[PDB]
Amino acid sequence: RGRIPGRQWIGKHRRPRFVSLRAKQNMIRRLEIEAENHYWLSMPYMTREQERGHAAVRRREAFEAIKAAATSKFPPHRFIADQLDHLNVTKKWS
Amino acid sequence: RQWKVTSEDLILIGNELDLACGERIRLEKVLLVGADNFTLLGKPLLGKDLVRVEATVIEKTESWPRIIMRFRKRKNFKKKRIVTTPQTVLRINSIEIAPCL
Amino acid sequence: LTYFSARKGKRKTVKAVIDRFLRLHCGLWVRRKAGYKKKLWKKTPARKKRLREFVFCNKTQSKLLDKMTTSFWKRRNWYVDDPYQKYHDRTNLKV
Amino acid sequence: KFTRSRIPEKVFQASPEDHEKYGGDPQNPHKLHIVTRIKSTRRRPYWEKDIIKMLGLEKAHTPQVHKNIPSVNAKLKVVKHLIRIKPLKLPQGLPAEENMSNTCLKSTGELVVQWHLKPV
Amino acid sequence: KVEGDIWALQKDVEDFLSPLLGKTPVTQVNEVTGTLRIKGYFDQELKAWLLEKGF
Amino acid sequence: YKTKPTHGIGKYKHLIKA
Amino acid sequence: LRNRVTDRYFRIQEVLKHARHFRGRKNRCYRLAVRTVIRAFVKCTKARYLKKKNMRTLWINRITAASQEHGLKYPALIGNLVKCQVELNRKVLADLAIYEPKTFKSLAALASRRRHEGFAAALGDGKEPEGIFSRVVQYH
Amino acid sequence: ARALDLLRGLPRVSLANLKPNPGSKKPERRPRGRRRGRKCG
Amino acid sequence: QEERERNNQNPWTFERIATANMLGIRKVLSPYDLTHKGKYWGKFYMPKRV
RNA sequence: ACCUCGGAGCAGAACCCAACCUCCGAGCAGUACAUGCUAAGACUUCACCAGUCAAAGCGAACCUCAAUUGAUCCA
RNA sequence: CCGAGCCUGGUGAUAGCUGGUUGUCCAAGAUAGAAUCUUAGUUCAACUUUAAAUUUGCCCACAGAACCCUCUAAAUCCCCUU
RNA sequence: ACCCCUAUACCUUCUGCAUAAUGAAUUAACUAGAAAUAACUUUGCAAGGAGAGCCAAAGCUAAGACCCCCGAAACCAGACGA
Ligand SMILES: [Mg+2]
Ligand SMILES: [Mg+2]
Ligand SMILES: [Mg+2]
Ligand SMILES: [Mg+2]
Ligand SMILES: [Mg+2]
Ligand SMILES: [Mg+2]
Ligand SMILES: [Mg+2]
Ligand SMILES: [Mg+2]
Ligand SMILES: [Mg+2]
Ligand SMILES: [Mg+2]
Ligand SMILES: [Mg+2]
Ligand SMILES: [Mg+2]
Ligand SMILES: [Mg+2]
Ligand SMILES: [Mg+2]
Ligand SMILES: [Mg+2]
Ligand SMILES: [Mg+2]
Numbered sequence: 001r002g003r004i005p006g007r008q009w010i011g012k013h014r015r016p017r018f019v020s021l022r023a024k025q026n027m028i029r030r031l032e033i034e035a036e037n038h039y040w041l042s043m044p045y046m047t048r049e050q051e052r053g054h055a056a057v058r059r060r061e062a063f064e065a066i067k068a069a070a071t072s073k074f075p076p077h078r079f080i081a082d083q084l085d086h087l088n089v090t091k092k093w094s
Numbered sequence: 095r096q097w098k099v100t101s102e103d104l105i106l107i108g109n110e111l112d113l114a115c116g117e118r119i120r121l122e123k124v125l126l127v128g129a130d131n132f133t134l135l136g137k138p139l140l141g142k143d144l145v146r147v148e149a150t151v152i153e154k155t156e157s158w159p160r161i162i163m164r165f166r167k168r169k170n171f172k173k174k175r176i177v178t179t180p181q182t183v184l185r186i187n188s189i190e191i192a193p194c195l
Numbered sequence: 196l197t198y199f200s201a202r203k204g205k206r207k208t209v210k211a212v213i214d215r216f217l218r219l220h221c222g223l224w225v226r227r228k229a230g231y232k233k234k235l236w237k238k239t240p241a242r243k244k245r246l247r248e249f250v251f252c253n254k255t256q257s258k259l260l261d262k263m264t265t266s267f268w269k270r271r272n273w274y275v276d277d278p279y280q281k282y283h284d285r286t287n288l289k290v
Numbered sequence: 291k292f293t294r295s296r297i298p299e300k301v302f303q304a305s306p307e308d309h310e311k312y313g314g315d316p317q318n319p320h321k322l323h324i325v326t327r328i329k330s331t332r333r334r335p336y337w338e339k340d341i342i343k344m345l346g347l348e349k350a351h352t353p354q355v356h357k358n359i360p361s362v363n364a365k366l367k368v369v370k371h372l373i374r375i376k377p378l379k380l381p382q383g384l385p386a387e388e389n390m391s392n393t394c395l396k397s398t399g400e401l402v403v404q405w406h407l408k409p410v
Numbered sequence: 411k412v413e414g415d416i417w418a419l420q421k422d423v424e425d426f427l428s429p430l431l432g433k434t435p436v437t438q439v440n441e442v443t444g445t446l447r448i449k450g451y452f453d454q455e456l457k458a459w460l461l462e463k464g465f
Numbered sequence: 466y467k468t469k470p471t472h473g474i475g476k477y478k479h480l481i482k483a
Numbered sequence: 484l485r486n487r488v489t490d491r492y493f494r495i496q497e498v499l500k501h502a503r504h505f506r507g508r509k510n511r512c513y514r515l516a517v518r519t520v521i522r523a524f525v526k527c528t529k530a531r532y533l534k535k536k537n538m539r540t541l542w543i544n545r546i547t548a549a550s551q552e553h554g555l556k557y558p559a560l561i562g563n564l565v566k567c568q569v570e571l572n573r574k575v576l577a578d579l580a581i582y583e584p585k586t587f588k589s590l591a592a593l594a595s596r597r598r599h600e601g602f603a604a605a606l607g608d609g610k611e612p613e614g615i616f617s618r619v620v621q622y623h
Numbered sequence: 624a625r626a627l628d629l630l631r632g633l634p635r636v637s638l639a640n641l642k643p644n645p646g647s648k649k650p651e652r653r654p655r656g657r658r659r660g661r662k663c664g
Numbered sequence: 665q666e667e668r669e670r671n672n673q674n675p676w677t678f679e680r681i682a683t684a685n686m687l688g689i690r691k692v693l694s695p696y697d698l699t700h701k702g703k704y705w706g707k708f709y710m711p712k713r714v
Numbered sequence: 715a716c717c718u719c720g721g722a723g724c725a726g727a728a729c730c731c732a733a734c735c736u737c738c739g740a741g742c743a744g745u746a747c748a749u750g751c752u753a754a755g756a757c758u759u760c761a762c763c764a765g766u767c768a769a770a771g772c773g774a775a776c777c778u779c780a781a782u783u784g785a786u787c788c789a
Numbered sequence: 790c791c792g793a794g795c796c797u798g799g800u801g802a803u804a805g806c807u808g809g810u811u812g813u814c815c816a817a818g819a820u821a822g823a824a825u826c827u828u829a830g831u832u833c834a835a836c837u838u839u840a841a842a843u844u845u846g847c848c849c850a851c852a853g854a855a856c857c858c859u860c861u862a863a864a865u866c867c868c869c870u871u
Numbered sequence: 872a873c874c875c876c877u878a879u880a881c882c883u884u885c886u887g888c889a890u891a892a893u894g895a896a897u898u899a900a901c902u903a904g905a906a907a908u909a910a911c912u913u914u915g916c917a918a919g920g921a922g923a924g925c926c927a928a929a930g931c932u933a934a935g936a937c938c939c940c941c942g943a944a945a946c947c948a949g950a951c952g953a
Contacts, residue, residue, distance in 0.1 A: 027687070031676055033328070033374055034686045039312050040375045041363055042304040043319035048360040048850080052870060059871080067844065074449055075912095077439045080626050086642050087633045094634075096571065098578045125570065126586075133586045135593075137568035137620050163524035168882070170661050172521070173814080198907050206907060215786095220928095229763060229785055237783090240749060242765085253762075255833075262908060270926070284928065290842055291695075293864050295685040334688065337848085344848065361871035365848070371688040402623070410621045414624075443914070453929095466854050467727045467861070475855055484901090491899095494812095512897060518881060526878070533877060647913035649936040654904055656812050663810065663904060663939070695863035728854075728866040730821085760822060761834035796951070803945090808883085808894090810903050810940070840911075 096125070099147065099186045110180040113151045118187070121147040127191065134195075146190040153183035196263060208265040216252070216260055220271050220283040224252040224260050294337060297367060320377035323356045324399055329372040341368045353395060412444040419446060426459055427452060542573035549580035553591040563597035564590065567616055668714050678702030678713075 008015040046054075097105050099121075113119065124145040125136040134140060162175035197207040217225040231246040238246070252260070261269070274280070309316060327347035331339040345365060346354050355378055356362050366375065382403035385393055394405040412419055420439055423446065427435045436449035448456075466472060495513050501523070502509060502516040509515040547557040564571065569590075571579075580587045593616065600614035634640075654663040679701045680686070682693055696704075703713045 028676065030687055031681070034371055034684075036312065037366075037370045037373070037375045038301055038684065039304055039308050039314065040320075040323070040377065041367060041370065042302045042308075043314060043316055043358075044360050044363055045319050045321055045358040046360070048870085051359045051361065055871065063845075071843070072436055073841080074436045074447070075438050078442055080441045080629070083442050083644075084626065084629050084633055087636060087640050090637065090639050091634050096575050098575050098582075126575075128583060128586045131585075133589055135567075135569050138570040161524050161527055163521065163528050165521055165525045167880090168884090168888085170657060172657060174524070175814090211786095233785080234783095240751090241767085244752080245766095253833095256762080258909080264908095266908080266926090271928090291863070292691060293695075295690050296864085297684060301684045333691075335691075338688075341848070357871085359871070361849080364850095365871080368848085371686065404623070406623050408622070410623055468864095469853080472727095473856085476857080478857060487901090508897075514895090514897075515880095522878090522880080530877080537876070643935090644913055647935060649912070651936065653812095654810080654939080656814095658814085660811065690863090698863080726861055727864085761832095762823090794952085797949085799946105799948080802943105804943075806943105808941080 099189075101186055101189055103186055104152070105149070105184045105186065107182050107184065108157070108179055109182070110154070111151065111182045113182075115151050115154060117151045119149050119151065119184075121149050121184075121186075127189065129191075134191075141194070143192055143194045146188075146192070148187045148189075149184040150187055151182060152185045153181075155181050155183070157181050206265055208268065209263040212260050212263045213268065217279065218260070218264070218268055219279065220269070221285045222257060222261075223282075224257050225249050225279075225282075226252060292335075294335075294368075302367070314377065319358060320379070321358055322378035323358055323362075323366070324353050324376045324378050324395075325356055325366065326351060326353050326374045327372060328374050331372065334372070338369050338372065341365055342372065345369070345373075347373060412446060416441060416444055416446060423448065423456070427455070430455065539573060542577040545577040545580055546573060549577075549584075549587055550591060553588060555591050555595060559598055560591060560594045563594035563601070566601070567593060567597050568619055569593075665711070665714075672714055 004015045005011060005013050095107075099105060122142070124140045124147055125138055127134050127140060127145045134144065156178040157180075159176045159178055162173075162177060164173040165171065196209060199205070200207055215226065219225065226249070228246045228248060228250065231243075235243055271283070304314070304316065308314075314320070325345065325347060327342065327350045330350070331342050342348065345356070345362075356366070366373065376399045378401060379399050380403075381400050385401070385403060389403050392405045394402050396402045396405075416439055420437055424434050424437065427448070430452075431450070435452075438447040440447070498513060498517050498520060499511070501520045502511075504510070505516070505519060507515075509519045543557065546560070550557050550560045571590075576587075576590075579590070597614075597616050600617055604614060604617070652659060654660050678697075681689055682697050682702070694700075703710055
C-alpha cells in the first residue's frame with residue numbers, strides 16, 4: 001500500500017529520509033574538529049619569505065638520488081658457477 | 095589474546111614462539127588472579143612479585159588447511175588458496191602467589 | 196597486403212607507396228604536399244611555397260609504410276649522383 | 291558546476307576567544323603539525339586525493355609530522371575536512387642521539403623523550 | 411675476448427672511466443661468455459687504453 | 466583581466482557618448 | 484589422437500571428495516558438484532568475519548545477562564570497568580560470568596562503586612578525594 | 624682456468640644434464656586457463 | 665530577522681560552513697548557496713531559516 | 715527537414731565543449747601585377763590530410779575582406 | 790518442404806550478425822575526439838601494457854591574461870618556493 | 872542429522888540480470904589461436920657476418936617467442952527427375 005515509484009532513492013518522487021540524533025551529533029563533532037583545524041592553521045611560523053630556500057638543497061639531493069636509481073639500470077651479472085652447478089642434477093653416490 | 099587459565103590445562107596459540115618443545119616459560123602480563131574467596135586485580139597488570147604463572151611448550155605444529163576461495167559471477171573471477179598457520183601448545187604448570195601484597 | 200604470395204610464399208609490397216614516397220636509409224619517409232599543383236590561381240605565394248616542399252612523415256605513417264614495403268626498398272643504395280645522398284644518414288641526434 | 295573552493299583568509303585568523311578556547315599562543319607559534327587522516331578520499335575529488343598522497347596521509351589514523359609553513363599550510367587547507375591538525379609539543383627537549391631509540395608520540399601531542407614501562 | 415679473470419678487468423675499467431664520467435660506470439660482467447658490457451659509448455677510449463696496456 | 470585591479474582601464478565608450 | 488587426457492578421473496575426484504556430504508545429484512555429478520563446492524568454499528572463506536562477530540555478540544549477550552542478574556547494565560559495567568583500568572575483554576568477562584560467579588559479582592560491585600563515584604564527582608567536582616577507585620595510575 | 628678445475632668435480636656432462644642459457648628460450652603463451660582464456664586476447 | 669540572526673544560539677551557521685567549505689559541503693551545495701545562505705531553495709524562500 | 719564552410723549565444727574571465735538547440739551569413743567581390751625568390755622560429759579546429767603567421771637574406775620601389783571551398787587517380 | 794526442382798561439385802562460399810572459445814597463481818589496467826554509403830564496424834588520436842634512455846613531473850605566489858554596453862559568478866590559465 | 876544464525880544458482884549478454892533475458896536432464900568420450908614485417912632476449916663472429924645469391928656509418932648470422940571454432944538465406948557448372 002505504501003508504494004514509492006521506481007527506484008526509491010532516485011527520481012522525482014523519492015522515499016523521504018529524516019535526520020536522527022545520531023547524524024546531527026556526528027555532524028556537530030566533525031564540525032568541531034574542522035573548527036579546531038581552522039584555529040591551528042592560523043599561526044604560521046616562517047611568513048613565506050623565510051621559507052624561500054630552506055629545503056632546496058635536500059630536495060635537489062632527493063631528486064639526484066631518484067635520477068641515480070633511474071639511470072643505474074643494466075642486466076645483472078652472469079657467473080660460471082650456476083651454469084656449472086646445473087650439472088649436479090645427476091650426482092649419484094660418490 | 096587474554097586467556098582464562100588454571101593449572102594443568104592447555105592453550106593453543108596461533109603462531110611460532112622460537113622455543114623448543116619441553117621449554118619452561120614464565121607467562122608475564124597477569125591482570126587477574128582469583129582463588130576461592132578472594133580475587134586480585136591489576137591496573138591493568140598485576141605486579142611481577144605477586145603472581146608467577148609457568149607454562150611449558152608441549153607441541154609445535156601447523157593447523158589444518160584453511161581454504162581461501164574468491165569468486166565473482168559473470169566475471170571469470172575465481173581464485174583459491176590453502177593456508178596452514180603455525181601453532182604452539184602450552185601446558186600451564188603452576189600459578190604461584192607471594193605474600194608481597 | 197599479401198603477406199604470403201600464392202607463388203613463392205613471400206611478402207609483397209604495395210606499389211602505390213613506392214610511387215608516392217621516398218625512404219631515406221635512416222628510416223625517414225619523404226612525401227609531397229597534397230594539392231601542390233591544383234588550383235594555384237586561388238592560392239597565395241606563401242601557401243604555394245609551403246605546398247612545394249618535400250616534407251617528412253609521422254612515426255605512425257613511417258611504420259605503416261615500412262610494413263607496406265619490402266626490405267628491398269630499405270637497403271643502402273650508392274647511386275652516382277643522388278640528390279638525397281646526404282639525407283640518408285642522421286647526424287647530431289641524441290636518443 | 292563543482293570546482294575547487296578558495297577559502298577567504300578571514301577564516302584563518304584566530305580571535306582572542308579562540309586563543310582562550312585552545313591553548314595556542316599567537317606569539318611563538320608551534321613549529322610542527324601532527325596531521326592524521328580521519329576521513330576517506332573516496333567520494334572526494336582527485337585533487338584532494340592527490341594532496342592526501344603528497345602529504346603522506348594515505349593510511350588513516352596514522353600521525354605524520356609536518357612543518358608549520360605557508361606552503362604546507364595551503365596544502366593542508368585544501369584537504370582540511372579530511373584530517374586532524376594538532377601542535378607537536380616537546381615536554382623535554384628535542385630527541386637527542388642517545389635518546390632517539392626510546393621515544394613515544396604519546397597522544398595529546400607530547401613527544402616524550404624517555405619512555406619507560408613502569409608506573410610513576 | 412677477455413681471457414683469465416674478468417673482475418680485475420672490471421676494476422681497471424671502472425678506475426679508468428670514473429674520472430671521465432664523474433661517476434662509476436654501469437657495468438655487466440659475463441664470465442661464461444667472457445665479455446664486459448659498459449653503459450655508454452667509450453669505444454675509442456677503451457681501444458686506446460687497451461693498446462697502451464699492450465693487448 | 467577581469468579579476469585584476471587594473472580591470473576596465475581601456476573603457477572609452479562611456480567617455481564618447483556619440 | 485596425440486596425447487589426450489588420461490587422468491581426468493583424479494581431477495573429477497579432487498572436486499567430488501568435497502561434495503560427498505551434499506544432498507541430491509550434486510554429491511555425484513560433477514557439473515553440479517563443482518558449482519556447489521565453489522559456493523561452499525566461498526562461504527567457508529567468508530564465514531570467518533561472521534564467526535568473530537557472532538562470538539562477540541554471544542559474549543555481549545552473556546555479559547548483559549550476568550550484569551542484569553547483579554542489577555547492573557552492560558554499558559555501565561563495561562564503561563566503569565574501563566574507568567577502573569581493569570582491561571578484561573568480553574570473552575573473559577563471559578568466561579568469569581559462567582564459571583566464576585563470585586569474581587563476576589566482585590567485578591559488578593566494583594563497577595557499581597565506580598559508577599557511584601562518578602555520579603558523586605559530577606555532583607561535587609572532586610572536593611576533596613575525587614573517589615578511591617578513581618585515581619588512575621600513571622605510566623611513563 | 625678455474626672452470627675446468629670446477630669441472631673436475633661436477634658429475635660428467637651427458638644428455639641428461641643439458642640446459643639452455645636463461646633468456647634464450649622464452650615460454651610460449653597458450654590460450655588455456657582463466658588468465659589467457661575465455662576470450663584469448 | 666536581524667534580531668534572530670544576532671541572538672541565534674547555536675554556533676553552527678549555514679553561512680559559516682558553506683563559506684569555509686567545512687566538511688567539504690560544497691560538493692553538495694551550489695555556487696549560489698554562498699550568497700543565498702541556505703534561505704533559498706529553488707524558487708522557494710524560507711523566512712525562518714536564519 | 716538536413717548533410718560543406720564562417721560569425722554570435724548556450725559556453726560570463728586560458729583552450730575545448732553537444733543538440734531534428736536559438737540567430738545570422740558564405741559558394742564572391744574590388745585593387746596592384748615583386749599577388750618575386752628564398753629562409754630562422756612558431757601556431758594549428760583536439761588524429762592525419764589539409765590550414766596559418768613570420769624575422770633575417772637575395773632582388774625591387776623608395777594587399778582589402780569572415781566564410782568565399784574539393785584530395786588522389788585520370789584528362 | 791517451388792518467387793523458381795533435386796543431387797554432386799566450386800565449397801572449409803561469405804557473414805561489420807548471434808553463439809562458443811578448455812591447467813594454477815600473481816601483477817598493471819575504465820577511454821577528450823576526428824573521419825568514414827559511417828554511427829551493430831574500422832583507421833588515426835586519447836587512455837591503457839611492456840621494455841629502455843634521460844630529467845624533471847604534480848601541488849603551486851607575487852606579478853600577469855582588450856574590451857562594451859548592464860551585471861560579469863563558482864572558477865581557469867601561467868606559476869618560483871614547498 | 873535437523874532445528875539457531877548468514878547467504879538473491881552458473882554462463883553469456885548488457886548502463887545495469889536472482890531476474891520471469893540466453894543456454895544447459897545427466898554421464899562418458901570428442902570438441903575451438905595457424906604466420907610475417909619490424910622489434911626484444913640469448914649465443915657466435917665482428918668492420919664485417921652469412922655454407923655463393925643478401926645485408927652492413929656495429930653489424931650480420933642462429934634460436935626463442937605470435938594472430939580460433941560452429942552457423943545462413945545465396946550464386947555458378949554439370950548430372951538426375953513427368
Ligand atoms: Mg520500484
Ligand atoms: Mg567456460
Ligand atoms: Mg593539431
Ligand atoms: Mg623580409
Ligand atoms: Mg564462418
Ligand atoms: Mg544474444
Ligand atoms: Mg591490481
Ligand atoms: Mg556495422
Ligand atoms: Mg537492455
Ligand atoms: Mg542485482
Ligand atoms: Mg536467466
Ligand atoms: Mg536475445
Ligand atoms: Mg531450453
Ligand atoms: Mg552477394
Ligand atoms: Mg538468380
Ligand atoms: Mg505419366
